[PDB]
Amino acid sequence: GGTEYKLVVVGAGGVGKSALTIQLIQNHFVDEYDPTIEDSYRKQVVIDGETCLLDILDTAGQEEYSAMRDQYMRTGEGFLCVFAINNTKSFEDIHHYREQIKRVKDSEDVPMVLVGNKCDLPSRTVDTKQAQDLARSYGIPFIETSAKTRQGVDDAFYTLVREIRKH
Ligand SMILES: Nc1nc2c(ncn2[C@@H]2O[C@H](COP(=O)(O)OP(=O)(O)NP(=O)(O)O)[C@@H](O)[C@H]2O)c(=O)[nH]1
Ligand code: NA
C-alpha cells in the first residue's frame, strides 16, 4: 500500500488539538469539537515530492492516564505536542506529554514536533524564544500555528512527517 504515517496529537485540554486536526483534514476551523471514542482521520498529501497518507489520531477526550491513551501512543509513529501560546499552564505541561511518549515508546528518540497554537489570539503569555529553547532541549522542531488563521498548520504536520522520515 501507499506509505502511511500515524500521527498522534497530544496536549492539555483546550489547546486546539482537534481544531488543528480538522483544519488539516477538512480545511475548516471549528469553534467547538466533541471528541468521541476514536477520532482518527486519513488524508493523502505530497511532502518533499513524495505522496503519502496521514492518519491523524486525536487524543482529545482521553483521560490523562488511560489504556486508550497508551494504545494511541503505541500506534503513533510521530507526535505533535501542542500547547496554546496564551496559556502558560499548557506550555508547562509539555514535559509531561514528552515523558509519556518516551515511556510508551521505551525510547528517547521519538519523532516529535512542539506546536504553539492559537498564535492569532491577543493575550500571548509564552514567547517563541521560550518554546524554541524547550524544543532545543528535546532536539525537536518548534512550529507556531493557528487553527483559525491556518498559519503553520500544514507546516506542523508536514514537519512531523519529515522527522519520521529521518529515522
Ligand atoms: N483563536 C483560536 N481558537 C482556537 C485555535 N485552536 C483552537 N481554538 C479554539 O479553542 C477551543 C478548543 O479547541 P479544541 O480543538 O477543542 O481543543 P482540544 O485540545 O482538542 N480540547 P480537548 O482536549 O479538551 O477536547 C475551541 O473553541 C477552538 O475553536 C486557534 O488556533 N485560534
Ligand atoms: Na487543511
Domain boundaries, the chain: 1-167
Distance CA 122, CA 140 (A): 26
CB-based contact 134:114 (threshold 8 Å)? yes
Method used experimentally: X-ray
Residue type, 48: D
Helix axes 94-105, 67-75, angle to 10 degrees: 70
The Cβ-side half-sphere exposure at 79, using a 13 Å CA radius, reads 29
Distance CA 90, CA 114 (A): 12
153 lines ligand 1 (CB under 6 A): no
Look up residue 50 and give its three cell numbers.
513524495
Closest ligand 1 atom number to CA of residue 118: 31
List residues bridging with 59 in a β-sheet. Answer: none
Resolution (Å units): 1.4
Q: Which ligand is nearest to the CA of 28?
A: 2
CATH architecture of 1-167: 3-Layer(aba) Sandwich (3.40)
DSSP 75-143: H-SEEEEEEETT-HHHHHTHHHHHHHHHHHHT-S---EEEEEE-TTSS---S-HHHHHHHHHHHT--EE
